[model samples]
Target: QSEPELKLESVVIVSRAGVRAPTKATQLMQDVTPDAWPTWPVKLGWLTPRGGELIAYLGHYQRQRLVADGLLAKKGCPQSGQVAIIADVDERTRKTGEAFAAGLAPDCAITVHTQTDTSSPDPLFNPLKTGVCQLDNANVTDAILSRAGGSIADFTGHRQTAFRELERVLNFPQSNLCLKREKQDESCSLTQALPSELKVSADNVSLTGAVSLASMLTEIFLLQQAQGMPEPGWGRITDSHQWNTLLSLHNAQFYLLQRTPEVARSRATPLLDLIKTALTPHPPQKQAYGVTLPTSVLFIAGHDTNLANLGGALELNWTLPGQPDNTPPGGELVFERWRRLSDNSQWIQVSLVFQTLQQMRDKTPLSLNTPPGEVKLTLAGCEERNAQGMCSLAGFTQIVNEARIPACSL
Candidate 1:
């Protein structure tokens, strides 16, 4: 209401795909619990119908905000090249891009572009796997272990109480996995039964053990509730308190794998450059993988790991109300550019936007009034800033460029 001199420029929204059927369950996921996994409406890992609807709601809300901010024409479809949407090659990501485009401009025929060869991981979204940049397995392992207090045991041991709660929900003491271990007259605890171990592959670093198992279980429960399945956690999780506790493990797993500084920079370099490129007023002359610049808004549909990597690289941290995961399904990191017309100085505002768990479950419509959860992010490298968390665009761009490994390309 008061900033007549500030002109909205462009927006770059990097979003995690919406809720979907859980990815193919691990053998540990199947063996840990006695009850059978519930059937899903779609194939493994594909976005559910409700998932797409939820994304559209976010899209609709975004459009309202953009139009109000004067980034786009209030009543007419944007002319070609003013809006662009690019997605990763996954079906879920591709579909999420389409759903968001529909909600962003309901009547406009906006196209969501992906790699011409959809089978492989796009280098922009998955920089480490492209072979342009390589991750040393030894270095990756050292970083992950250092974050976990030098060993996998230290990490799992710290989460003993969380594991116990998960075991209670699965009735693990009476389940076949535990019972078989008990037959040997050994410890029946999950941590004892399946000790934690680390994996550092050519392109990835991960943990496999009780902590990993708990991470998967917690995510599945959250997704089940988001998908509106009856009695998420099979009715064992009674309230938000328990949900938050269990989901912390999921968040922790991401922190070690994707949010570690070394890991994040390697995984996110190209995507970070893509975003920096998108926010510019003029499209750059160089193009790769059919990449195009955004004149008004750019939406990048990617996975939770992608968001985690960006968060790590930027040194961002925040907690979303009513949702436990730092980067939940349908969550987004929204970057806005605002120019002070008189001075011609631009500022950047980075916000974490997402529907709360209840909103997703209830399929609530979002708007300026009934808004979704949003937290203004403070960039660690943003030395100059305002109370609203706006930082100089120049400062932000410098931070992003420094975080990128210059050798990596899209």
Candidate 2:
């Protein structure tokens, strides 16, 4: 027995920021009406910002949710499970910082997927286009045993096509076996002579099982190809803005299912527990950052009306600052689910998270020369006479009254 020869394919790194294309920011002011989702405004009141910060925040949140859900995994952390955490915070921080300086709230999201091609030799290849072949079945059985390094009970004592012929006869439908065979001796093969109850329908069972088996094999193959590679200082970042500071660490969740689903569903608690187990803390490596788990898990076994209802359960709405009077749109984040030509279903989520400037700097070495934003500071003082009519020092106050200060606080 020999091991199956495996070949490596070209690997590519994918990130949400790299693949994402800028789209027209949906204006909540124009999109939502006072009558629609009456309570939405109250729910998202705190998220509102004067600029497009709300949109960017939502986008990053959705992206992170997708990554957390196991729908998207980082490129280099393949073996680490279905999710990768960004240990480096510099590059992300910088990007978010820049966005914030530009009047939009800071946000960052990333996703990675791998593709692979594999093949194996098929010896004793029979040309039969449909149904089972006698020589092929024998060769396949032999191949499995060879791979397993084991032997099976010998069934080779019969004729060359004995197995296939017997299978066909036993499965032939709607005939009085004994009467027909008695009238025609030529049709009285060992299979027809067997007890009626001994026969079985092998064709349907084999076909259905083959379909499922092929699907499972393909999934396993893809999973293997998506393994991550080692990189030095891979996850370090240096951005330290307030917003980015909070989201520097990675967070995730995962969901699993024994079978694929036609529609999406929230991750089950058992699967979430499995994900949590995989995310337990480990010693930090110089190259990779801290331990990160899948952000969210989605397990869909079959399509049902409840699938659509699950969309409403997603929590990702945010209000822009100073937009308290306006009505908020329900589910600021939208996920689109579709079935591909192969009948496989996929969905995409949009969310947001603030990234630190230092982390962004570490990640984007080439962008080091970039200048920081300019912020202004102001100070104020009030003088008042005490009850005794003596002029005394009042309270001193400080504010951002300067003409401008660099975006990079330091």
Candidate 3:
């Protein structure tokens, strides 16, 4: 006998804020490159119009999917309690949520929830800063070092080529022309700053040195490309190989800084718990950080770092074919609940959904036939699964419980 057909039910999508200008024009950022940085239409870090449109395209595509699966009605706006969108306090995140809602249900009265006080970070997204959780300096440092294979020097050495390419892209000697003349033979080179080091403050964690510099610059180049700048990296980045090589620095930084299990467990528990709640068939309740649960679809507009944190906690890994950054801007981690019609059995499916680099740069509109890239993820603790790569709801719940650090949750 054949197995029963499955039905799509609830879904939760955790998305990174869309393409944006560089967050800062710091001294180092300016000093590292000879070419002048272009002025952005909006302030640094705010989402561009293009970025919003890109996200809207994704939202529209998802709407079609949901409608086809019978989760949403095609002819009308979502009903009350059917959908919820929660965004961080940052302008980029809030606007991203708005863009998604617009595409999901155009001309519909939908509210994207965010804290009225924009100055303070949301506890759900900034638990460490808001005192909802804590990470010891020593513990965090050790965790990063462990991820670097016990020696920061080794990690830097492994990425020598990427750092060298960044130096070329920046015209390092020209950037330090005045300083080099003053020092006489003490020319500045990114390689001289080798061996990345970790910095853990009360509110954040970061890396310093060559790899750190490359990580920042590569992301800026990516943003420039996505924003349709005339010359990203002064038109020096020639091919896919170069893009991947340079972005490897960015990927490595996130892997160490945000994806470390020690940090992920403490920082991502609140968001993970929210996803778990959305997956469960329970009544909507007021959640931590002023979040409201929806009956059908829940969208959380966060940052790329947030995706990295959850990736570590869930042991989820996937790479977009055309995008080098695993957690590219506007990318999403989608969690879907599926029910077997015959036996009333439920399962959970997870996937990494994203717009390709080309799509982002080209501003391609997406639909059901021309969909964005999607790679199904295998939840670590619930590896045994059916053909569709879904695990039982019970197994999924067990995985979440095991991954969570309840003490850190609000």
Model 2 whole-model lDDT (C-alpha atoms)? 0.22
Best by TM-score: 1
Off by over 4 Å in 2: 1-278, 281-316, 319-351, 354-410
The per-residue C-alpha lDDT of model 1 at residue 360 equals 87
Tens-digit lDDT string for candidate 3 (97-212)? 99999889998957888877889888888588898767878888888898898877778878878877877888876775435445456646575633467788656788777777
TM-score of each candidate structure, all chains considered together:
0.95, 0.16, 0.94
For model 1, how does the per-residue alpha-carbon lDDT over 25-77 read when each residue is reduced to its tens digit?
Answer: 66667678888788899999999989999999999999898889888777878
lDDT of all predictions:
0.85, 0.22, 0.85
Residue-level lDDT tens digits of model 2 in 1-410: 95312111111111122101112122321121111111211112121121123223323343344444335443232334222322112222223223222221122323221111113211101011122221233433333334223321121222214322222322322224434455563553332233111111211111122122222222211111111112111212112221222111100000101111111112112121222223222343322123233222211111111111122112123322311100111112121221122332221212212222222223221111332111111111213322222121111101111111112111
- Show where candidate 1 strays beyond 4 Å: 182-186, 283-291
Better of 2 and 3 by TM-score: 3
Rank order (by lDDT, best first):
3, 1, 2
Give the C-alpha lDDT of model 3: 0.85
